[PDB]
Amino acid sequence: PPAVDFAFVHSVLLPDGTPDVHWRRANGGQKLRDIMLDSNIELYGPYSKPLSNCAGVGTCATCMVEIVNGKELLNPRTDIEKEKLKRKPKNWRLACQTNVGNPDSTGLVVIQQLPEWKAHEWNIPKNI
Amino acid sequence: SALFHLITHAYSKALLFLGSGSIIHSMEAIVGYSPDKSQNMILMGGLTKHVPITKTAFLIGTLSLCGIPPLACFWSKDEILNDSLLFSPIFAIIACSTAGLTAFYMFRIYLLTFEGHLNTYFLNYSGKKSGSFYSLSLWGKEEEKKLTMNNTKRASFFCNKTYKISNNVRNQIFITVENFGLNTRTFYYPHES
Amino acid sequence: IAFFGIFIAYCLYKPFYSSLLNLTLLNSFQKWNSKRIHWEKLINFVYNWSYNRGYIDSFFKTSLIESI
Amino acid sequence: INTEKLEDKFGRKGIKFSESNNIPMVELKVRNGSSLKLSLSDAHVLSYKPKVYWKDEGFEEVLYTVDGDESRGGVGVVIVNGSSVISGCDWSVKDTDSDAIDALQIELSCTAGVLDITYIVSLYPVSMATALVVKNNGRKPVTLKPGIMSYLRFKKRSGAGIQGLKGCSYCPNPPLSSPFELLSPSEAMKAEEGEKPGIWAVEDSVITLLEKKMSRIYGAPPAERLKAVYNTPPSKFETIDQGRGLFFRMIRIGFEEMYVGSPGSMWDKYGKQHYFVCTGPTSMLVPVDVASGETWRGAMVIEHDNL
Ligand code: FES
User: Fold this and answer.
1) Which end of chain D is least crowded, N or C, by CB within 10 Å?
2) Would the CB of A98 count as within 6 Å of ligand 1?
3) Which domains occur in chain D, in start order?
4) Residues of D with CB below 8 A from A15's CB?
5) For B103, which of C6, C12, C18 is closest by C-beta distance?
6) d(Cα D160, Cα C22) in Å, to the nearest integer?
7) CA B116/CA A21 separation, integer angstroms
């Protein structure tokens, strides 16, 4: 079946000092929030309580996720991600406004959840 | 009844605001000075453990707004609804609904701040606290001289290979350089004002 | 009604390791609401209300001070 | 008192070695009043009293051990092949110069022939870290199955959960045979509601209760054979007490699946107070094979965020 390969590196490093990769399988592209919630990975963080976030529409800047190796199969920034966050390293997208594509999709997007409250910088190779 | 409600509200919500300022000036030691952080109720988290007097003050204030009968001020709202419910159908049942909503959001305000884990030094979210705590590894002398600059550990160096897919490795080599420990290792907890 | 509001706040925001409620009920709470589709509109509208400030500030800053 | 010799060899400011009832034992006390008692020569950590509350004596006991019988109680490391490989009580310290006062570490080491099973008990001011590492020396790859069986005590019989194993699949599977058992593997699946064999089921409860007998293992090693994404199970979860207001987090590193065991109502057959739970990370269904000379690591970390 068409399976998109997520990674979902956690922000907190393990006690070993190495990151943890979880490799969620969830099929197709509808919404990265609904994928991370259906497949049960920590998206919000302390905003995971019910009314502590806008729950999908994009009015808060809470479900922001740093995505690297993700220039391949995404929707572009929908001017809510371009406005609700304005000064970020540009690898950070809101999971409920972004979309990883259509059902017939395969890819290796790696999406560091909770970029706020992190210790690492990811050293993305310079574009162009 | 309006003036008694005003008196109890102005002695309860003023207490809640002074408690909020004490919460805030306890939180500045955590998150520095930023109203999007030092007043953000979500990452206030848990402060019953650290600031107990402010906890009791804010708890008494919020329970006075919810109308708790023995150890708080219910009787103002009691006279309100007693003089209101036999007046009109519109301005009675919706007033009681908003009183229930008042109880809800005020206790949410109390719970998101005081009861729970700190949500800012929480080791499931805060990687800086983790990097500050584990000053040494779990192996001692093995597996490294120490490691910073961990690469894309998508295979975890476990001799794992991919099946028929789009791609497994590529020209994407990104060094996830972690931070250090044993530096500014204090990270003091929120003490009382 | 006040204790009902208190309880709706308690079952959500009080954590499981410190809540005086029984775990057998707290798990059924999320089991009944594991879908989050009918709550994904109610919570959405309530947060939109609280974040747009009832849209009244936007209406005034679009039609009263921008009008002036 | 050989532990006096080990104390003048490796004793530090927060590390205290003791020997009573011919048991070599060590206490690790970090700066914040968090104590950790380990029985040497056995790789069996007994008691763990980390500072939970902000009182003077706010530290609370975590690991369930019975009063006089240290052999049955507390967290212990385990190896099998299919018999207990480390049944020999030949563990010896290796080093302790770990940190100033803040975090301490003991390096036990034994040898089961071609295997040098060395072992790290590290105390950080909020966490136990129990970390095994083995290394082959012979010309045969070994098919060992390791595990770290922890026994956490809860004050209330009804206040028991794990809070975060949802979404990942589980199979009801008996525990690994330990010298530090509390229930045998044959009775852990007996007298239920999960069926004994490895039937697979996706979890649909955000916090699974530990009221019943159900003693299972989370992970899908059948999909691990695929070595695709395979939905790696969560490497951490919040075990809660709810009788007293605290919780803990069991982080697994290197291990693949997570075993949980609820004694159910049959804890009265062994103990009368402090109903417990047998939780630990393992690689049990699909074993681990290192090499004819390589090394393999695996660790379990209990940490609290109450402090
Ligand atoms: S949840 Fe509010 S932005 Fe995605």
Assistant:
1) N
2) no
3) 2-303 (2.70.98.10)
4) 124, 127, 129, 251, 253, 299, 301, 303
5) C6
6) 10
7) 27
For chain A, say whether C37 makes contact (Cβ under 8 Å).
Answer: no
- Joined together, the tokens standing for residue B22 give 């004490």
Give the contacts of D36 (CB within 8 A, at least 6 positions apart).
Answer: D27, D28, D29, D45, D47, D48, D49, D50, D104, D121, D123, D128
Q: How far apart are CA A11 and CA D264, in angstroms?
A: 36
Distance CA B36, CA B145 (A): 41
**Rg of chain A's alpha carbons, rounded to an integer?**
14
Mutate to test the interface with A, among C11, C44, C46, C57 (most CBs of A within 10 A): C44
3-state secondary structure of B29: helix
Question: Phi-psi region for residue D293, left (φ > 0), alpha (ψ -120 to 50) or beta?
Answer: left
Tokens linked to B191? 């003490």
Q: Is the CB of A80 under 6 A from ligand 1?
A: no
Q: Which residues of D touch C31 (CB under 8 A)?
A: 204-206
User: Contact at 8 Å (CB) between D246 and D304?
Assistant: yes
Torsion angle in degrees (nearest 10) through CA of B159, B161, B167, B169: 10
For residues D268 and B73, what is the distance between their CA atoms, to the nearest angstrom? 48
Collect all residues of chain D within an 8 Å Cβ-Cβ radius of residue A45.
Answer: none
What resolution, expressed in A, was reported for this entry? Answer: 3.6
